[PDB]
């Protein structure tokens, strides 16, 4: 009754490379699970929005523009106000 | 207990390749689509875009996380730091 989860297939070295890219210097060993959780949640949200938009458009394939449409609903995040 | 220091960025670059492998990401997307109960699937360009946004989101979230860890006067980031980074961004 227990199936596999592909989110555990996203390796730790890639996570650490992403962290390094984000400017992190040292990380804990018990962080990867939470990371995978967050990744999966965001991906879920965007996929669901884009899929919804495609379905309503009455089409059988999600175009990259549908994904853009989905991401526009995610808002834009910056630093400061300008 | 698994605590790892990351390699120093000696110099940054402007355009950067993605870091997550194509196929694992793809089958993850297929899983998520599967569990959302839908019969349609993504274009390759669309999955490309998805990955771009995922990794962008992640780099930003890690920036916020590092910031939170700095404000706790630490160098090593923890789970709570990421949760805080999520809330900071504007999640629930």
């Amino acid at each position: 009754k227990i199936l596999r989860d592909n989110i555990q297939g996203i390796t730790k070295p890639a996570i650490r490379r992403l962290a390094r890219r984000g400017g992190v210097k040292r990380i804990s060993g018990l962080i990867y699970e939470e990371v995978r959780a967050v990744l999966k949640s965001f991906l879920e949200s965007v996929i669901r929005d884009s899929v919804t938009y495609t379905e309503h458009a009455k089409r059988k394939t999600v175009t990259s523009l549908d994904v853009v449409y989905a991401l526009k609903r995610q808002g834009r995040t910056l630093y400061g106000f300008g | 207990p698994g605590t790892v220091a990351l390699r120093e960025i000696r110099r940054f670059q402007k355009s950067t390749e993605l870091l997550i492998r194509k196929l694992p990401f793809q089958r993850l997307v297929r899983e998520i689509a599967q569990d959302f109960k839908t019969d349609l699937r993504f274009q390759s360009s669309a999955i490309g875009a998805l990955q771009e946004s995922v990794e962008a989101y992640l780099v930003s979230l890690f920036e916020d996380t590092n910031l939170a860890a700095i404000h706790a006067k630490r160098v090593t980031i923890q789970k709570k730091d990421i949760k805080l980074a999520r809330r900071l961004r504007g999640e629930r």
Partner: protein, 361 residues
């Protein structure tokens, strides 16, 4: 002479030292994708790098690099493209005695670019100046980020900065509807009203019938044939998100048309969401179109100038770039080392020239 051109702009009394490393114009890959059924236009590339350094003491020979900028120059039969690849600082400029509150780096960048434009301007040939601004800790000088006196601007800061660098060069020409010139800014994630905020203040007082700064892409000025596939309408620079995306898109080709992007507007609509442009910081693409009226063999003579082979140039630049600038002493040592390396590569005992400012305004 670049030493003079730079000397004219710098404040009076400010003594610096410059090293200008370039390469001979050699055949390269086409900057623009080839339209279907045609050979790519022949292109001549030419490298450039300016290194500005100072001295913590007026007497001794302690030399410290304060600034560095790299410029590629492309030449096709109908176009000259000046691309600003990377530009970084070490922030040890605070060691200069009576270093004015004036934006020194902005003046140096401005002067260098001006010099290149002037010396590479061809009769009846369109000249474009492209660059891609994104704020990051260090580009050329490793560990310079750890020097507490190095202050890297944020996103909007760096964009505004590059726009203030480019503005005066644009001001030296006539508006477009004699030599004409127009400026084009694009900040992914920003509408025109928000983008206009990044323009120099001068843009606020331009003639509304013929403005100088635009929030768009110079399409009909770069490509005589707008019926060509979008792929052939965007420059493919080294280390550039535009390039990466263009490749990822070219992966869709088997006609010339992609499958997921049919127009340029779609291309930019997508660009605003790529990995580089939406990582929490802002990003700005910039172009400067210059239309001419109607549209040792080197112009630089200073002893700071050294013309190396492609291989030797890469050697020098890569040598300088993989150094250390964590501290004062390390930066000094690195400066000396690179200086000697360049002197060796050009079969001389010394390369570089001192410069002193004449401008007193």
């Amino acid at each position: 002479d670049l030493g003079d051109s730079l000397a004219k702009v710098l404040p009076t009394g400010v003594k610096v030292t410059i090293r200008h490393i370039s390469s001979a114009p050699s055949p390269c890959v086409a900057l623009f994708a080839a339209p279907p059924g045609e050979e790519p236009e022949s292109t001549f590339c030419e490298n450039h790098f300016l290194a500005v350094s100072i001295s913590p003491n007026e007497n001794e020979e302690s030399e410290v690099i304060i600034f560095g900028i790299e410029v590629l120059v492309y030449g096709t039969a109908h176009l000259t493209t000046i691309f600003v690849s990377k530009a970084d600082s070490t922030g040890y400029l605070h060691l200069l005695k009576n270093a004015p509150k004036v934006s020194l780096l902005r003046l140096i960048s401005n002067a260098f670019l001006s010099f290149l434009v002037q010396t590479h301007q061809r009769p009846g040939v369109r000249l474009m100046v492209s660059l891609f601004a994104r704020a990051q800790n260090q580009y050329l000088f490793p560990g310079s980020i750890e020097n507490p006196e190095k202050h890297v601007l944020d996103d909007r800061g760096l964009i505004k900065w590059w726009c203030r660098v480019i503005d005066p060069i644009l001001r030296e020409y006539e508006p477009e509807t004699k030599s004409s010139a127009t400026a084009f800014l694009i900040v992914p994630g920003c509408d025109k009203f928000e983008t206009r905020g990044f323009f120099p203040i001068t843009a606020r007082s331009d003639g509304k019938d013929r403005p100088r700064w635009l929030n768009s892409y110079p399409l009909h000025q770069l490509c005589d044939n707008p019926n060509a596939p979008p792929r052939c309408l965007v420059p493919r620079f080294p280390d550039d998100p535009k390039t990466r995306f263009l490749i990822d898109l070219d992966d869709e080709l088997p006609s010339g048309h992609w499958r997921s992007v049919k127009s340029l507007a779609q291309f930019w609509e997508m660009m605003s969401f790529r990995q580089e442009c939406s990582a929490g910081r802002l990003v700005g693409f910039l172009w400067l179109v210059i239309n001419p009226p109607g549209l040792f063999f080197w112009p630089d003579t200073g002893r700071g100038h050294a013309v190396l082979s492609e291989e030797d140039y890469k050697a020098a630049i890569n040598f300088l770039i993989d150094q250390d600038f964590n501290t004062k002493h390390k930066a000094i040592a690195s400066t000396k080392a690179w200086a000697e390396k360049v002197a060796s590569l050009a079969d001389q005992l010394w390369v570089g020239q001192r410069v002193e400012g004449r401008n007193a305004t």
